[PDB]
Symmetry: D2
Subunit: 367 residues, 4 copies
């Protein structure tokens, strides 16, 4: 059964800092054993050789193990997703999701935040980017969606995932058994792994019909409107975030789409959808501390243009467009929220329309 959720966004003061999580536990805001998911941004390069993700992961799991009754083995099964790369003003942070004990919940028929978690069946190197990944992910998303107590896909607003990369060893693992892989460049496998996962989410939620192998990274009109996929277990980790009626709690999630890197109105639409009443032309000062965080994807479009204007992102061998567009949308987004602590993630194949991406917002509607 779905439980009421407490959500807290905390800053990371350094690469290995989990002190703010420790403080939340100490002050009784949440119990260590009730942390069911963490979604954060780390200050690494955001690519393959980003070791800030494991540094934060160790620091956070050490807190959870030290202050709870869970074993390191049980703590190790908590989904924690670290999206590296905080280019520009983006501030390293972690959004903590925890269940609320029944004696602190006020049950209500209003839609309130609920979280579902699942793990897919083993992802083979040869599956990555193909229909095998799509079917296995789609099944796991259906699992997590049911685990959240959500029956209507329209009540799912945000599916944050984690999927593996193709490495030198897994690439051999395929060739040992005879098989081919989609790509042998590990950096490109990042975009591929997120894309194939996104297609699985879109299928599970009924946003698209089952695609074919030749659609992956090619048919960019096929996408999920709630998928936020990251890489890079030998299995897709799934975190479904939506709303359920009759659970209680003070937070609510909504979403929309950023049609391109400058679509601030899409971000405001997400915040409105989450339940915050805002003016017709809102401004960051209207939020009054009620926006916990936003979670969105961005990408450089394959046509090399934004609103009719050419940019040179796709030809830049000096600074990969991953970093360029992340910094850009980081500013666009933080300008809306007024808080540089925003979850902005790059590599958005099949996640929102080309050149854009989904955007979810969590707001505090409680007293």
């Amino acid at each position: 059964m779905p439980e009421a959720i407490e959500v807290r966004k905390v800053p990371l003061h350094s690469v290995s800092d989990a002190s703010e999580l420790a403080k939340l536990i100490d002050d009784g805001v949440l119990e260590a054993d009730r942390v069911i998911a963490v979604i954060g941004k780390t200050e690494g390069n955001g690519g393959v050789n980003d070791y800030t993700r494991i540094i934060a992961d160790r620091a956070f799991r050490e807190v959870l193990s030290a202050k709870g009754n869970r074993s390191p083995e049980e703590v190790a099964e908590v989904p924690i997703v670290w999206s590296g790369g905080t280019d520009g003003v983006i501030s390293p942070h972690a959004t903590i999701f925890a269940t609320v004990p029944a004696d602190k919940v006020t049950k209500t028929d209003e839609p309130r935040l609920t979280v579902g978690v699942a793990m897919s069946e083993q992802l083979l190197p040869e599956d990555i980017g193909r229909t095998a990944m799509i079917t296995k992910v789609a099944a796991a998303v259906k699992d997590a969606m049911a685990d959240a107590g959500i029956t209507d896909p329209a009540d799912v607003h945000y599916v944050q995932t984690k999927t593996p990369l193709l490495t030198i060893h897994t690439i051999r693992d395929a060739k040992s058994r005879g098989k081919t892989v989609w790509t042998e460049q590990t950096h490109e496998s990042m975009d591929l792994s997120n894309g194939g996962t996104a297609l699985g989410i879109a299928v599970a939620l009924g946003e698209i019909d089952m695609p074919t192998d030749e659609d992956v990274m090619h048919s960019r009109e096929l996408f999920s409107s709630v998928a936020s996929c990251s890489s890079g277990l030998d299995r897709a980790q799934i975190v479904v975030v939506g709303n359920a009626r009759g659970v209680g709690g003070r937070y609510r999630i909504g979403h929309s789409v950023m049609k391109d890197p400058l679509d601030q109105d899409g971000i405001w639409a997400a915040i409105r959808d989450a339940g915050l009443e805002l003016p017709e032309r809102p401004h960051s000062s209207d939020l009054d501390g009620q926006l916990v965080n936003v979670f969105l994807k961005c990408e450089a479009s394959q046509d090399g243009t934004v609103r009719g204007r050419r940019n040179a992102m796709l030809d830049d061998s000096d600074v990969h467009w991953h970093r360029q567009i992340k910094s850009c949308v980081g500013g666009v987004t933080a300008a809306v929220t007024g808080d540089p602590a925003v979850f902005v993630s790059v590599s958005a194949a099949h996640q929102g329309p080309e050149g854009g991406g989904p955007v979810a917002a969590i707001v505090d509607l409680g007293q």
Copy 2:
């Protein structure tokens, strides 16, 4: 005497493309010999080894020479400033400034756009970053300010400059005569050259008292509110842009300040100051094609924070913060204008407050 000004922003379709300038001349929008200044963004890395600036410079001067009566020598004296680096959505473009023949001008008492140009006395390597650069720049700014027909410094809204770097040869040139230089790193000399130039502008316009050598790059509370300095002649090139009454024309300039990288309200204040009436909470769709361009500076603050949130820009050895903050503010700015063709420049020592910078806007008020 100040003349009425025609202003046109055109895209660059490639690194060597000046076809849009050629088209403006062919269609009679402006005469080649009346082009007095060009200010543009090029798609290079924006650092020391950025050769897109010279490629655009050659392409543009070839057009001016081919379609005018001016010799290549006279064309060579036209101030053309190319700010490299178009990280993110920023679109390569050039803003062309031209005088209008008297038989096409409607004289008016309303403030309208006027441009003044000057060259300072020779800048010695040992001057760069010291009071020598400040005094020589301040004198040239007073020259250009008078050349624009501007007597009140409050009527100066935008001073775009070009100053040299410290190179292996000029560094010897100093040591040959005995002298020391401020830095021997050419990449750092970029920030220094712009900073010392900015202090000169601030002195000339009476924004600050004459500083000392130890203030340069250190006393960041001393700044000009209209300086936009770029590098990197052995002389400061100065382009003063302001308004004059009784000249006529259809364009007007205004300015404000971006207090930090997310200060969109500062950009809107510049547009309002330029003469466009806008709603209380404006949006890009209110502009109705009346905003020609904005010109602004950005920088990562030395305290490493934006609105109380830590970022890791100053410690990033992978992608210099020059590129990170440029992409970020590029998005913030283009979100306001709705046009990725924006003049966003990085390296803003003594140009606006720390972590921010000046922002000027040119609007079309004509029929």
Copy 3:
């Protein structure tokens, strides 16, 4: 008929410098109209957005047009290959190949340098990286090989090429006609274009049997021992360099293979093969100004190891391994020649064994 060849390596003093070529012509070392090929290194980033290649190309073709009777159209057909990226000590330079007038040649039965040039049939975006590119290249290599007066493939020591990339427009050009492309990442298309071209050279010279599409970038045991391919016309440009008996001249070419990035003995083997007698353990001081240049390829092996030791090149999202291994092998090679002006090129799929590449040497055997 093959003509005797004069070969001169000159430095570039700046990005746009062709003064050393101009000096060679002025001093009567060579005639402008007799320049048949130029192969050089430019100081750009060596990737997609490297504009130092076109800057050098324009500067060099302007010299050839200005000092010869050839029209700009005829000069435009001279194969000039600029390999960008001079990471580390590699010094920007150009190797100039020119025919010698008959009244300056001493015919000899000794093997002496000869150059052959050809152009393949149009390369379609959909051909790139597939058997279509391989067959079209193989035919052009047979053309250039015959144009050099070479009948035995063992007399071909160095085939320098130029092939196009997959761009946003050509990718559409395929999809407009229905077709698929190998990759849509332009940076990766560099490695693909060179690889498919290398396979064509290997087929033409009988080094391999005709491969299949699934071999390209995958069967790295299939390679040419003389191919040096660069990108990125809509056609493979081919420059075959070998030896012919009975032509005369003072230069001779030889080659071997660099088995890995540290294989200096492979470079020395190339110099020995070119005709220079050297000690058993040679050193750079044994060359006595008789080595004109070396031309070689390098790459990071897919197994991520060099001589049993792991390196992290393939996982580095900060500095692409293209640049890392180029700088590394630049030092290894310049340590052998004693001259930082070495032609070191990266991206070596099907060019020498995995982790290595071919290496050719041109020596001056004349009085």
Copy 4:
């Protein structure tokens, strides 16, 4: 009293791998509590935001604490220097230094390896790069030199150090007390901290007279021939490595200088100086497993040339010359040793002549 030393170079299989150290302890090669120093290369970017250094540091200290009787506090005082950045073929590794118990030592009058350690007095931000750092370092080097049982500075072959950087907090710490700092760019403070430390070593060992503040980073003819300084405690950590007679052991150290990035003969001179007899023109195959490691510094010269040839390292805003020259000299060095596991460090102000650096070699002379 100096003790006999056991030296072992082990690879790192991953960023957090200390298994090879654990194996050495388990097999009885060395005792955990007798490890007195570790000097290693890690696969990070080698700049300010390199977190592979702390990852390796934690992994290695955890082994030392787990397998010894030393407390984490005592283990924390063991000097461990991690030089990040393994550009090109350089393989991540750690050289472990341990004392040998008396019942395993064969005392000999031959010069054999000895290690001395010291800590300087507190380094103030305002000291960095000035005569204060030089005097405090010089005193600590004299301490470590005596701790190694070395009386003649000619018997010191290698002084590996660790010194702090200037950070946002320490820079305030100076300005709070009134003081100025040398630079406010943290990336540049790396080169400064190593330079000032190198001058201290040179003074202590009598290689130079006491310099002045204006010499630091400027008088590059003043240098130590054994200093290898890294950054970045609030104190200079010192590791002196030399030879002593009458101690016993099987290893010996020697050194020379690399006059420029291609000076392989300098590396061979170091190996010869260490006691290995080699041919006149040695080759890597002559080493027969007797070379434990080499330790050297490299840098791009301020004149921008190597052996009369221009390179573009100092103007490269895309890939800092730190990374370019490190990869280059990594290849040059590994070509000599035949082992990519080489200690190659960049940033060499006052460490060997300009454009070069010291090079030390440790060889195994035992049965």
